[PDB]
């Protein structure tokens, strides 16, 4: 139990030699390594270094592993000490984990020469002038495919058809309704053109990416790639369906499905998440707030049912009750709780209005609870950017 | 409780003022002070259904203050509640 | 900017869904998707004027999600702004 | 733990914790955990210096924790058997 | 590497003279200034 004295810029530390010997590969645990710091006149080891850090280094030996950074010591300084006392990488790693940090990945296209060459223009806008031009061009195409998708509903463009006044719903006039544009190898319809130029580009990005892809193993793992796929699935699935059902009576039998896929085209907005950090942050925020987000829906659910029920009964004995059934009152309850209150349904009886007041107040409190957390998770990912 | 109490104090105040400010009207949407309670709670919690709205300059001035005071009143006791929750 | 961007993403999404969910109606208050932009921003910021409201079960389901998503979206960038202010 | 060469007691342990242990004797009872010392570490010291359970309990109360209950169906055999499914 | 001891109201500090000499214009780095 020979004792050992360690002097850190005047601050005296003592321990047993077996305590340090516990970790033979460190500076203080290696006789040949600490030798250089021994003062034979004072029988102590002297280090002209940072004082606040040492309590922690020493405790690491005493505790047998615990390496915590003192609350009052900067992380940049403490890590420099950890390195100096040569505690080793295994300990620094675990230290950095508990301190917050942790991560690291990548790996350019394995050899390829050309694969790893292209995979730097469609995957890393931070590489060259051209590669950065792609991002600019890619975004344009997306914004366009969105504006296009939107105008397809503008009556100003769809009220200029054969049966605009109601007199002969044609087949290729009926299928153009269900789709938004007139499909045809003649490319007469402006919309079918733009929508096609865009899918060509989106089809290009997907293929290029999938071939110049380093690890084609987990390609359909990256949520970003899933989006690129879903952004074009409607287009091809629609063609397939309109060709498999080329007759009025058959296309009418598969019109529902066609409509569904038309709705699915909106998911192209999420193709922007590749060129938007904030969009990526929000995504992470949502994956990290699953429980609170759910609690939010659950609490709203509990509230809706309660207040829908009470309002219903309190307005029941009325000839002009705006609440036909309890399920009908669900709309009113969610509307007043989130306080969006459209006023399209309002109680009229003293009782109903009392229920409404409590529903308004309970709504404000319910929402206000899970949000703070969500908001936090957001700031964590938003700031932990650099 | 403080939340309900403060809302109560606000309702009565603004119900009273709006009532009087819209009193000399043939189309006053506020028949009595107790009738205005609904409007006051509705605008304070800001759920504002629009089923009762002042029409006179005075009423609208009262309404503006009721909207603002409502937002502040609620915002007070919540932070604590939210805390107890966390 | 993130505030405007997120609102933008939300508007388009909910304008689209509400449009389609109220499409097969003779009294649809949503003529086109661009027309629904007004409703979406109005319900998300929760100012909800009630000058456009869904009527179909589907539309009302979309509306509920739009109301909730709106409240969360706004609540995010604000805290920071509020800070910079203090 | 006594070192007869230096006339002192020596403990190869955690430094930040001791001010508190000693103060516990000086104050005649006050056992507070230093703001800068982790709770897992400080409780290990409290145990080592054998301050006793009566003090650790009161320490843990002031530190926040506190609770404990249960007790399966007293005997029963079958009572305590069902009372584990419902 | 002559060592230097600095006593601040009883709190003991030690360092090497070359460490202080690194900044010649400061009080502790100036022999004529710390002499006092
Ligand atoms: C609707 C919104 C969809 C939003 C999709 C967003 C997709 C974002 C995809 C993505 O890039 O996520 C990576 C992390 O993945 C993850 O943790 C996994 C995130 C999964 C998110 C799932 C969201 C589902 C909705 C980012 O790593 P990175 O090094 O750049 O971070 C650096 C940063 O920490 C600052 O140093
Ligand atoms: Cs609010
Ligand atoms: Cs409102
Ligand atoms: Cs309204
Ligand atoms: Cs509101």
- Domain total for chain B? 1
Residue A117 sits in the same domain as residue A194: yes
Task: D52-59: list long-range contacts, CB under 8 Å, 24+ apart.
Answer: D55/D24, D55/D29, D55/D31, D58/D31, D59/D31, D59/D33
- Count of beta carbons in the 10 Å neighbourhood of residue D2: 9
DSSP E strand boundaries for chain A = 3-8, 11-16, 38-39, 44-47
Which chains form contacts with chain E, at 3 or more CB pairs under 8 Å? A
The β-bridge relationship of strands A38-39 and E3-8 is: unpaired
Structure tokens that stand for A294 in this block: 């759910």
Judge whether D11 is closer than 8 Å to chain A, CB to CB: no
Rounded CA-CA distance A272/A279 in Å is 8
Mutate to test the pocket of ligand 1, among A226, A280, A281, A382 (most ligand atoms within 8 A of CB): A280
Distances from the Cα of A24 to the Cα of A33, A43, A178, A330, angstroms: 10, 21, 76, 70
Strands A38-39 and A44-47: antiparallel
User: Are the Cβ atoms of D14 and A62 closer than 8 angstroms?
Assistant: yes
Which residues are found with C-beta within 5 Å of the ion, ligand 5? Answer: A 339; B 46; C 46
Q: Provide, as residue numbers in chain B, all residues whose Cβ is less than 8 Å from the Cβ of A353.
A: 38
Residues A328 and A386 reside in one and the same domain = yes
Q: For ligand 1, atom 26, which residue shows the shortest CA distance?
A: A280
Cβ D36 vs Cβ A70: under 8 Å: yes
CATH code for position B20: 1.10.287.70
Cα-to-centroid distance, E19 and ligand 4 (Å): 73
Helix (H, G, I), strand (E, B) or coil at D9: strand
How far apart, in whole angstroms, are the C-alpha atoms of residue A292 and residue B85?
A: 12
| Claim to verify: residue A333 and residue A356 sit in the same structural domain | yes
The CATH number for A231's domain is: 1.20.120.350
Dihedral in degrees, nearest 10, Cα atoms C38, C42, C43, C46: 170
- The backbone torsions φ and ψ at residue D3, rounded to the nearest 5 degrees and listed phi first, read -105, 100
Ligand 1: residue whose CA is nearest its atom 31: A385
Of A101, A131, A151, the one marking the end of a domain is: A101
Q: Identify the bridge partners of residue A220 per DSSP, sorted by sequence position.
A: none
Calpha distance A26→A20 (Å, rounded) = 9
Find out whether A327 and A311 touch, Cβ atoms under 8 Å. Answer: no
- A239 near B CB under 8 A: no
**Residue A7, token pair as written in the block:** 């002097």
The alpha carbon of residue A38 is apart from the nearest alpha carbon of chain C, in Å, by 52
The verdict on a CB contact (< 8 Å) between B49 and A361 is no
In a domain, A107, yes or no: no
Q: Which helix (H) or strand (E) holds A136?
A: helix A129-151
List the structure tokens of B83.
Answer: 């805390």
Measured CA to CA, the distance from residue A305 to residue A114 in angstroms comes to 61
CA A166 to chain centre: 47
Please tell me the distance from the alpha carbon of residue A361 to that of residue A77, in angstroms, as a whole number.
Answer: 51
Reported as type and span, the H/E element at residue D3 is strand D2-3
Taking the CA of residue A75 as centre, how many other CA atoms within 13 Å lie in the half-sphere pointing to its CB?
Answer: 8
3-state secondary structure of A272: helix
Q: Are C54 and C18 in contact (CB under 8 A)?
A: yes
Q: What is the 3-state secondary structure (H, E, C) of B15-62?
A: HHHHHHHCCCCCCCCCCCHHHHHHHHHHHHCCCCCCCCCCCCHHHHHH
Listed by number, the residues of chain C in 25-84 with a beta carbon closer than 8 Å to a beta carbon of chain A are 31-34, 43, 46, 48-50, 53, 60, 63-64, 67-68, 70-72, 75-76, 79-80
Query: CB-based contact (8 Å) between D14 and chain A?
Result: yes
- CA-derived radius of gyration, chain C: 14
Asked if residue A3 and residue A69 are part of one domain, the reply reads: yes
Q: How far is CA A209 from the centre of its chain?
A: 21
A347-A351-A354 Cα angle (round to 5)? 80
Residue with tokens 């036909």: A324
Q: Is A202 exposed, middle or buried (0-12, 13-18, 19+ CB in 10 A)?
A: buried
Enumerate the residues of chain D whose CB falls inside 8 A of the CB of residue A3.
10
Tell whether A264 and A124 lie within a shared domain.
yes
CA distance A146 to A124: 24
Q: Which residues of C touch A150 (CB under 8 A)?
A: 12, 16, 32-34
Q: How far apart are CA C70 and CA A323, in angstroms?
A: 26
CB C27 within 8 A of CB C56: no
**Which residues in chain B have their C atom more than 2.5 Å from the N of the next written residue, marking a break after them?**
none
Q: Which helix (H) or strand (E) holds A226?
A: helix A223-230
- Dihedral over alpha carbons A311, A313, A316, A317 (to 10 degrees): -120
- The domain that holds D31 is classified in CATH as 3.30.710.10
Identify whether residues A305 and A245 lie together within a single domain. no
Per the structure, the complete domain to which residue C36 belongs is given by: 1-86
E30-E31-E34 Cα angle (round to 5)? 80
User: A332 and A345 in contact (C-beta within 8 Å)?
Assistant: yes
Tell me which chain A residues have a C-beta less than 8 angstroms from the C-beta of C43.
Answer: 340, 342
Tokens of B31: 């028949």
Residues A168 and A252 in one domain: yes
Element (H, E) at E13: strand E11-16
Whether chain A has a CB inside 8 Å of the CB on E16: the answer is yes
Q: Who's near C20: CB < 8 A, 6+ residues apart?
A: A259, A262, A263
Same domain, A27 and A80: yes
- Long-range own/partner contacts, residues D15-21 (CB < 8 A, 24 or more apart): D15/A55, D15/A59, D16/A55, D17/D41, D17/D42, D17/D45, D18/D45, D21/D45, D21/D46, D21/D49, D21/D51
- Quote the CA–CA distance of A366 and A12 in Å, as a whole number: 56
Q: Which two tokens stand for residue A232?
A: 């074009």
Whether the Cβ atoms of residue C64 and residue C14 lie closer than 8 Å to each other? no
Q: After which residues is chain D broken (C to N over 2.5 A)?
A: none
The answer to whether D50 touches D11, Cβ cutoff 8 Å, is no
Domain boundary among A275, A292, A312: A275
């Amino acid at each position: 139990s020979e004792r050992v004295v360690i002097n850190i810029s005047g601050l005296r530390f003592e321990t047993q030699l077996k305590t340090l010997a516990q970790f033979p590969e460190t500076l203080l645990g290696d006789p040949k390594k600490r030798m250089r710091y021994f003062d034979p006149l004072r029988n102590e080891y002297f280090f002209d270094r940072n004082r606040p850090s040492f309590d922690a280094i020493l405790y690491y030996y005493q505790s047998g592993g615990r390496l915590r950074r003192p609350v009052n010591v900067p992380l940049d300084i403490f890590s420099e000490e950890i390195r100096f006392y040569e505690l080793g990488e295994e300990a620094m790693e675990m230290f950095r984990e508990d301190e917050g940090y942790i991560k690291e990945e990548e790996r350019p296209l394995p050899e390829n020469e050309f694969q790893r060459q292209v995979w730097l223009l469609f995957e890393y806008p931070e590489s060259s002038g051209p590669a950065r031009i792609i991002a600019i061009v890619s975004v344009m195409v997306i914004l366009i495919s969105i504006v296009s998708f939107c105008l397809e509903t503008l009556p100003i463009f769809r009220d200029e058809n054969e049966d605009m006044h109601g007199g002969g719903v044609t087949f290729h006039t009926y299928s153009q309704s269900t789709i938004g544009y007139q499909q045809s190898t003649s490319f007469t319809d402006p919309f079918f053109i733009v929508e096609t130029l865009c899918i060509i580009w989106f089809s290009f990005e997907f293929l290029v990416r999938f071939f110049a892809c380093p690890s084609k193993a987990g390609f359909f793992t990256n949520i970003m790639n899933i989006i690129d796929i879903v952004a074009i699935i409607p287009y091809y699935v629609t063609i397939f369906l309109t060709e498999s059902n080329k007759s009025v009576l058959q296309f009418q039998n598969v019109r529902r499905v066609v409509q569904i896929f038309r709705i699915m085209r909106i998911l192209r907005i999420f193709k922007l998440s590749r060129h938007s950090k904030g969009l990526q942050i929000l995504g992470q925020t949502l994956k990290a707030s699953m429980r609170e987000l759910g609690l939010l829906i659950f609490f709203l659910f509990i509230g809706v049912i309660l207040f829908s029920s009470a309002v219903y009964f309190a307005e029941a004995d009325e000839r002009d009750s705006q609440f036909p059934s309890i399920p009908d009152a669900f709309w009113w309850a969610v509307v007043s709780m989130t306080t969006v209150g459209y006023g399209d349904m309002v109680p009229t009886t003293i009782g109903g209005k009392i229920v409404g007041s409590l529903c308004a107040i309970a709504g404000v409190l319910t929402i206000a609870l899970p949000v703070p957390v969500i908001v936090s998770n957001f700031n964590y990912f938003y700031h932990r950017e650099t």
